[PDB]
Amino acid sequence: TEQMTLRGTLKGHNGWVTQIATTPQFPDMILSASRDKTIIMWKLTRDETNYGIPQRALRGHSHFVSDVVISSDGQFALSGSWDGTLRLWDLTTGTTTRRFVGHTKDVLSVAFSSDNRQIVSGSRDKTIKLWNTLGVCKYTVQDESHSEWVSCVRFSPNSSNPIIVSCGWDKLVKVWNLANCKLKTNHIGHTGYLNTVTVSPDGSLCASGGKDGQAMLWDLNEGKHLYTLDGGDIINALCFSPNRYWLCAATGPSIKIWDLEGKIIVDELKQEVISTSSKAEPPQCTSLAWSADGQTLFAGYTDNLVRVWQVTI
Amino acid sequence: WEVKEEMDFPQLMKMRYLEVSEPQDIECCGALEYYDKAFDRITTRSEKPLRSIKRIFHTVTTTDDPVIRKLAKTQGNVFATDAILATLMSCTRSVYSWDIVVQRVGSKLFFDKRDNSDFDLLTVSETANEPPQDEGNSFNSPRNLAMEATYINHNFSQQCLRMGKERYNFPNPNPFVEDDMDKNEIASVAYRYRRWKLGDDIDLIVRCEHDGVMTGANGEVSFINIKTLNEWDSRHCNGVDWRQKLDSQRGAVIATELKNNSYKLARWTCCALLAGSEYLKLGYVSRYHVKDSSRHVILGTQQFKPNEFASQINLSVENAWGILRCVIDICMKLEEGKYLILKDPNKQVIRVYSLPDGTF
Amino acid sequence: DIKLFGKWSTDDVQINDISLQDYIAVKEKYAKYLPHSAGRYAAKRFRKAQCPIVERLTNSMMMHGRNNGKKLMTVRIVKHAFEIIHLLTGENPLQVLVNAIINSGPREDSTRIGRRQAVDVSPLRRVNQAIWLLCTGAREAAFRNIKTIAECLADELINAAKGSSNSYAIKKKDELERVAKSNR
Amino acid sequence: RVQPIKLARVTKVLGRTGSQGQCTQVRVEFMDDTSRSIIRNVKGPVREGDVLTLLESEREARR
Amino acid sequence: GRVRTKTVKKAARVIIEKYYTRLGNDFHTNKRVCEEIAIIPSKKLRNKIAGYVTHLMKRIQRGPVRGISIKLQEEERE
Amino acid sequence: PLQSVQVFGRKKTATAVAHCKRGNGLIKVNGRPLEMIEPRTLQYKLLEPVLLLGKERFAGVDIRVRVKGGGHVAQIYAIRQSISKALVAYYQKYVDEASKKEIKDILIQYDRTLLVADPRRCESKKFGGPGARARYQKSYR
RNA sequence: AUUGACGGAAGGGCACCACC
């Protein structure tokens, strides 16, 4: 009875939707990063004609935007791109304030701290480098880093053992201790490149996924391995859920929602049938985001859309 | 049942009486409503779906209709409501059978609607090269494709104009044509009464249709009609894609629709001509994807003059009015008994049957 | 409400010939304020059927090599010819132009296979031929004569649109059909 | 003195012909008789969907 | 012309046979992989090779193309 | 108070830079009004943005164009493109993106060149003839 | 018997320094 429905789309993009971000302060505004080199700040006018309308575009970078994240107060955004830079946007004006320029190659992912004091990024030059809110590269880890690219680097919103979780294309999940920027635990399980990594809201669990189509849950207190779930296709993004004990994943063109207590698929959200001729693959979901109330799932896609899945009861 | 008159399409091809003066007016009634240029200018690669609107049925025979019934017995002896002379004006184009009831009671010659194995609903692809199979209860079956087509010209008619805005009110109300209780869904559709000379007391009291009015670029009254086509399964009847060609090769789309639908286009053209309207609006409607009904999208609207377009359906109003006069001539020898004009479906020749004991 | 040169409406023209409906571009999307635009219509095939018909008439008037490239001159002679047409006839000059295109186009030609077997004519090619015939009729009527090119263009396509044989384009069309009928 | 002209819609373009490659061959469907798809030679640029004015009908092409 | 030459096709084939596990049907990620793993002296040749790699990976999914030998043979137990 | 954008528009070698700021409906090219630019045959090309978008869309801005390079016709096409792109960029940056979408659809639907530059430029002459493709007349016998 | 060149041989292809 707790399945979802398709409540409407958010047109207005000219490329794949590589990342979507929300914030608990403003429940009427989401950010979507794309491959048309622009970020769109939406306004959720939940009406019949359109669920959302593009309120304001941000047009800084010169390549695809590959990540985006909103600060805690919901005022400053942080974006990373394939041109090798990071930008700290001020949402009210719509213009950038700081431009981080250390990274040589394409910046795959960006993250913020819980208190937004220090930020971290990851890139195709096989380095994970921290920064601060003023604009200077503080510390660039190089010892025992990933042998291939880094594709998702995230913090952990929890006071005890503040850590940096990361994953890359060498099939390894590394847990970094933030106080000394030293390696702490190395996870070796995955058998294909890792496209995403996520941390549970309650700061106890972590998830990881990629090419092998399987999602592995790793404990963050003792570095163990709880279990592993199997998705149909390439896991392009994972996203835990704040209110409910669920893990969502974007497997190929569908979205699988694994419960974490009975470990069954509660729902497998599929898009409707279009292009009835069986000559082309459907568009693949690329990103996932949960609203703070946990009643709405925003899903990026490959046909330049952003679909809105609403949970029912 | 008695057999009285039978004539083929060949005789209708060479029947003519060009005696049609500039028409007068008797009375105009019915509130009008304006349109939206943005809904008109919707074009290919900029789609918009087709919802459902509520059409208040207003098809009534002249005798039962109170406005006509308070004017038919007063003056005039030949009467025919709108979209009913098209039957006699599309004989050489049609291949199927229609049914209508001309009652020659006394000197009165008033047309009325009757049903005998055929209905008044829209007929699609009737006279095309390699006609559709229409077998069983398929998606392309005749009654269901016709029901889908009537669905579209009922909904899109009430979906192209700004219906929610304050409807302009003409001076005379339409009596009993959806007037008993104000359902508030009474459309812009107005009806005129006009009289023109054609022959031996053939001052024809004729109803008209105005499916809306469009405000001028400078601003004035300019009546319009809203009627639309439908696309389905382009491989059949030697079709062509509208979602790839409407923007730059719309002329070919009109050409192939004329080639496919000829009786239907003539049926519409008769109405758009006799109404004296300014613009004829043809909407272009197509399915969301092939082999899937109950879902449609409006791909555009084209404006052409109802007279110019009558010249482009290779239809002569002279021979049309003449075949009308000649079918009235063939219906002049008959008597007070009414006549159900049921054509022959398989082999297209016009026919009629005098009704025993007023058969209905 | 886009009016050609600011004063000629474009929604009451009527292309009465079904064949030339999608080649004489004059209404609803093809309305423009001027017969001048950076074209790029000779890039791909058939793209010049998406050009406004007055800009084709303007383009085909920059001819004989002393008037090559002089498009502003042809724009103003088209403007002046349209004003002369509206004075003489009493109807929209775009309608008169469209009727001159329809009447002046040849619909059966004769190609050299050998003796010249008759052939049918494409709609785009008969639009091309109609434009070229009207332009050269105007051009050769205004050469070494006190009349100006605006009056000659006006009287040329007025006589074309009405169908009389005193135009040059009607003479050439009749001659082409006469040979292509006597030599089927 | 001769029969009236007819209109015909091009159905598909078969390929070009003529000595210098000037003409092109198409198969047209009449707009009145709704049958008898005949091959005709047409001068000038022709594509699918075009409407042709046939000054003389009932004559088949070279092929 | 748009006809890829022998250098583009042969390079694409060797890249696929050696690095099948790192290529999807995405031209841009393929371009980045081929610029990490190969030494291509220009940027047009890199783009042409990545385009043919993308076009071939869109054929690997629909059966084994003649000319490419990979570990996919093993999973054809049948 | 810094509400201003500078956007450009190019036709062949011409380049017009339109400066659009907050103001009260004034458009001036090189200090001259918009209805006094010299090729008054092609006046409606200059008036086309204001005639498609109306006056209320322009009645809250001050536009001042400065054009340099190219010939007369190329200069007024640059003026056209710069005015349209300037209004679109001002609308995008300072009011809302829905309004930008609406006016960009109106302009793009009428004519693409109001927001996309024409990429054609003159070709290079070769050493066989008078121009790029033409060649000198060749003689036999 | 082979390679080249030629045929006022017989088939294909190409080029606005060839044509339409």
Ligand SMILES: [Mg+2]
């Ligand atoms: Mg002179």
Ligand SMILES: [Mg+2]
């Ligand atoms: Mg030169």
Ligand SMILES: [Mg+2]
């Ligand atoms: Mg020559």
